[model samples]
Target: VLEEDREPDFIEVNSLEEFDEIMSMDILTVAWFWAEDCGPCKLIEEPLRKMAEEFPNVVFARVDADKNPEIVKKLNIKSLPTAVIARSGEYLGDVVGARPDLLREKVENILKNLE
Candidate 1:
C-alpha cells in the first residue's frame, strides 16, 4: 500500500474523473490497465511506482480494466499490464506486458515528443 508524502511511482486512477485531471495537465499520459488479481500486474507495481516517482513530469494513471469495463472496451485494451502513453488524446507510445526498463524507455521517448 502507498503512504502519504511518499511520491508515487505510478498514479492509480479508478475513475474517469481522475483520468480527466491527469489529461488536463497537458503532459504525456502514461496509463496502465491492470487487474488486481493478475500476477504480472502485481509484479510490475513496485517498479511502476518507482518510475512514477522518478519521472514526475510524466502523467501516470492506472485504470482497473475489470472495474472500468466501459473505459477498457472504449480504449480497446485487450491485455493486462498494458501501458499506453498519450498526449492530447493521441497515443504516442505503448508497451504490452511487464517490462520496467522497456516501459521507462518507451515513455521517455514519448515525453521527449512533448518537449
Candidate 2:
C-alpha cells in the first residue's frame, strides 16, 4: 500500500535517525504513528493537516508503522494510531487514536512550556 499522501508541513520520517533529527529541531513536534489500511489512522490525516496549518512552527511527522519497525519498537508503540508529542528531542506525551481534541489539548500544554 501507499505510504499515504501529505501536505507541505505534514512530513514523513523514514527511519529512526530522520525522526530524531526532526525531534531535535522543533520546539514542538507531533510524531504520528500509523499504518496502511488503518481506518482510525486515516481519520486523523485531515485534522493533523489542519493542525500543521494552525501551528506553522510545529513539526508534524508521520511515521509509517509498516516501514519503520525500529522506530515503532523503540518508542514502544503498540498501536496503529499513536501521536507522540516531543519537545527538543524529549518525549512530552502521547495521544492514541483519532482524538484531535486530546491532541490539541496536549499541544496547548506544550506551547505554554515553549513560552
Candidate 3:
C-alpha cells in the first residue's frame, strides 16, 4: 500500500522561528544553506529540489544564508550550497559544495543509516 504524503519535499525556512519548528520535528531533515548571489548555490538548487522528492522519509528545507545569518553562524556554515542532515533534530553530518555526486552520496548515506 502507498503511504500518504505529509509535507512538501522542499520547505523554505526564513526565520529562526521556522528553523526551530523544523529542527524540533521528530524526523529526518536536510537543511540546504545558500545565498542569492552564490553561483554554486544556484547550480545546486534544482538538483536538490529533484532529489527531495525521492526521499519520502526525509524533510528537505532551504535556508537563505543572507536572510538568516544567525543560523549560518550557529551551524558554523562557512560555505555556500551546503547540505546539512539531521535525524530527530540531532546533527549527523553535512556536504559542503556544488558537487552533485558528493551531495547525493552524503545525503543518501545518511538516509540509508536511518534504516
Candidate 4:
C-alpha cells in the first residue's frame, strides 16, 4: 500500500505525548480531529491546508478519531470534524464541524488574542 500524502505544515499526531507537547508549547495550535468514515472531515481538509499555508505561526495538527479515542473523549469531541484551538496549554476554544466560516473567524480571533 502507498503511504498517505502528508503536508509539511501539518502535524499528524499519533500519540498523547505528541498531543500534549504541542499544547504545552509556547505557540498557537489547532488540534483537528477527524473520523474514519467522515465526509465533512474530508471537506475541511482543503481549507485547513490553506490556513496552514497562510498562517505559518499556527501549528495545524490532525488526530484520527477512531485511532485516538482517548483524545476525542477527553476533548469532549463527539463529532466528525473538530478543531481545538490552544495556546501554551491554555484552551482557546473549539471550531466544530464543516463550517470554514466559523473556523476562519475563530482562527483570526486566536491570532489577535495571541500575547
Candidate 5:
C-alpha cells in the first residue's frame, strides 16, 4: 500500500470539485482509474506514486472506480486498472494494466510535447 504521507504529486480527488480542476487544467493531466480491491492496482501503485513525486509540471489525479461508478461508466473504462493521459482536455493515450516503464515513457513523451 502507498504511504499516506508520500502521496504522488498528483491530486487525489474524491469529489466532483477535484474532477473539475483536471478538466480545467492547461497542462498534461493523468487520471488513474483504480479499485481498492484489485490486486493489480496494488502492483503499480508505487511506480505511479513515484511518478507523482518526480513529475512536478504534470498533473496526476486518481479516482476510485468502485466508489465512482459513474466515472467508469461515462469514461467507458472496462478494466481493473487504467491510466488516461490528457492535455488541454484532449486524451493523448491510455494504458489498460500495469506497465510502469510504459507509463513513465508515455508521461515523459507527453511532457516533452507540451514543452
Candidate 6:
C-alpha cells in the first residue's frame, strides 16, 4: 500500500466520476482495485508500479474499493487486487488476485493486439 501522505506513482482514482472519465479516454488502460487494509492488495502494489513505468503508453490507475463502492458493485468485483483492462469504453478482460505474472502477460497480450 502507498504511504499516508505520498501519492502513488500511478493514478489514484477515488470516485466513480473519475473512473468514468478515465475509461472514456481512447487509450489502453489498466485499473487496479484494492482495499488499503488487504494484505494481498498491498503485495501487488510494487509490481503494478513497476508495470506502470514499463508501459508508459498505457494508463495505470488505482481504485480504492472502500472509497468507490459504486464502481466496485457495478463491476461486480468480488476480490481484492483485481485488475481490469479496457480500451476506450470496451471491457477487455480482468485478473483477480495478486498474480503479477498473469497481470503482465494479460497486459502484454493486449499491447500486442494493437500491432
What lDDT does the true structure give each of the candidates? 0.80, 0.85, 0.83, 0.85, 0.80, 0.89
Q: Where in model 6 is the C-alpha error above 4 Å?
A: 1-7
Clashes by residue pair, model 3: none
**Model 1 error, position 39 (Å):** 0.5
- On TM-score, the stronger of 4 and 5 is 4
For model 5, residues 1-115, the per-residue Cα lDDT tens digits are: 8756744445776776667668567888888888889999888888888888788788888888877877777678888689988877678899888887888899988777654
Per-residue C-alpha lDDT of model 6 across residues 26-83, encoded as one tens digit per residue: 9999998989899999998888999998989999999988988899998999999899
lDDT, candidate 3, 9-90, per-residue tens: 4798979888978988988888889888999999888788888887777788999899999999988888888888786678
* Weakest ten-residue segment in model 2 by summed lDDT: 5-14
State how far residue 55 of model 6 sits from its true place (Å): 0.4
Q: Write the per-residue lDDT of candidate 4 for residues 1-115, one digit (tens) a residue.
A: 9799965647988898889998998888888998769999988888888988888888899998888889888877888798888988998888778887787788888788756
Worst 10 residues of 3 by lDDT: 106-115
- Show model 3 residue runs off by greater than 4 Å: 1-9
Candidate with maximal TM-score: 6
lDDT of 1 by residue, 1-115 (tens): 7675855456768677667667666677789888989899989988988888878877778888888877778678887889888877677777899887999998777667654
Model 4: residues >4 Å from true position, as ranges?
1-9
| Runs of candidate 1 exceeding 4 Å displacement | 1-9, 17-21, 112-114
Q: Which numbered prediction scores highest in lDDT against the true structure?
A: 6
Q: In candidate 6, what residue range of length 10 has the lowest lDDT sum?
A: 1-10
Please list the Cα RMSD from the true structure of every candidate, rounded to 1 decimal place: 3.4, 5.2, 4.1, 4.2, 3.8, 4.2
> Model 1 reaches what TM-score against the true structure?
0.82
Clashing pairs in 5: 9-52
Better of 1 and 4 by TM-score: 4
